[PDB]
Design a protein around this ligand. Structure first.
Ligand SMILES: [Ca+2]
Ligand SMILES: [Ca+2]
Lengths: 254, 254
């Protein structure tokens, strides 16, 4: 009964890093939503305005370690992007129907975890409205991908993964386990989830766990196959990721 | 060698986290210092101008979880601040000779660790030069405090602290170790350091470590005096905190 706590801090440590890596990101849209140059662009856009920003956002994505940062207009169209030089440049796409647009518009801020339309590449989409006098002038967006955290967490050998409240493995030190489940889903909500995750493909097959028995703590004994590794005795702890509505779980070996 | 692995990783983690927390703040001056309304406010000390900038910084700092974000003009007087409504408002205060001001003028930027000059709140002061034409118009400063990271650390059960290159502890899981040192310092270089921490009471003695064996690991066993007592034995690891000039040392028990 001695791994319990040890794994329990290991987990609080993981959640914690993940809090901070999300917050690191969140600042970008935060400063950018008020930015006079961002603002300028949206009232009176012209070719040099939008170029300055394309670069301002290019340098920022680099320094912020963001996958993509892009500015969307009032209509839902992307106007400037970090990836503007890429063939995958998001400049000109229609995001009007994405929740990170519409929720940023309704609320001032929004965050939604999804699969890039073309990238098939998982991310937390973070957003903020840009206020106009009059009213909304557009939305700014930053995409956090989490290969860095995941490669941190592989580096422990307590494997770990993060679920949203529907029980869905969004972020994982074990690639294969991305998008499986902790909780039972039923008929009704299977296709709808696909939808929002932009991964109609998704398995929603449950992580290969047998012999779940809840030790007093709400920590659990556990038999897992890993990618490897036919079968394996293990310990499961949980923690809430502060600043998010995600859950973290760490399996400790024996 | 069993503790070494365990502690090598945990410390690596502890840095990464520190990295994410520092980096969260780095971005605000990064952007603030280029923001036309930052500029205007410094070239047009208007009162609408300063009005706005005040809650602008209030809002950003609150979200940012920066402890204070404030804006100094060329003469060093601070002109708008997150905290314009607490009695501890930095507004009208002279910071003309603080290094964070002075070096951001001479160099473009500066990060400087020091005690709150009225608070006794230790923190990083992350500063950026507002250029104009004709030369610099002022500096924008975001102060990062470390109480949250110190509390994540208290929780881990492996005391850890960060030293600059001077050998001084700045961030520490054990509060009474603040401004204790790795290397002895000499009598008359105390003055200038106390003068720069903005803390004449900086104890600046060597950490109370004894009986150090350096390993083949380049980890080291040591005996430490625990605040209160007793002296427990510890394994010590070292890692550079990535993208700072800071260094983290972490003690794990036996
Ligand atoms: Ca969330
Ligand atoms: Ca540094």
């Amino acid at each position: 009964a001695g791994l319990a706590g040890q794994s329990r801090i290991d987990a609080s440590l993981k959640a914690s890093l993940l809090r901070a890596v999300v917050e690191r990101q969140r600042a970008l849209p935060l400063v950018l939503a008020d930015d006079a140059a961002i603002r300028g662009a949206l009232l009176s856009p012209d070719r040099p305005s939008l170029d300055r920003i394309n670069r301002k956002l290019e340098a920022l994505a680099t320094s912020a370690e963001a996958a993509v940062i892009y500015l969307i207009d009032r209509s839902g169209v992307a106007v400037a992007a970090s990836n503007w030089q890429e063939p995958t440049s998001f400049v000109g796409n229609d995001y009007a129907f994405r929740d990170y647009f519409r929720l940023a518009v309704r609320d001032g801020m929004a965050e939604h975890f999804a699969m890039g339309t073309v990238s098939k590449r998982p991310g937390l989409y973070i957003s903020r409205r840009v206020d106009g006098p009059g009213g909304p002038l557009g939305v700014i967006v930053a995409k956090l991908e989490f290969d860095g955290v995941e490669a941190d967490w592989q580096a422990s050998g307590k494997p770990a993964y993060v679920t949203d409240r529907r029980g869905i493995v969004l972020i994982t030190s074990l690639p294969s386990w991305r998008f499986m489940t902790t909780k039972p889903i039923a008929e009704d909500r299977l296709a709808p989830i696909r939808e929002s995750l932009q991964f109609g493909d998704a398995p929603l097959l449950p992580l290969p766990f047998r012999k779940i028995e809840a030790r007093p703590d709400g920590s659990s004994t556990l038999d897992a196959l890993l990618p490897g590794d036919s079968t394996a005795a293990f310990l499961r702890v949980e923690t809430m990721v502060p600043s998010t509505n995600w859950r973290l779980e760490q399996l400790s070996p024996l």
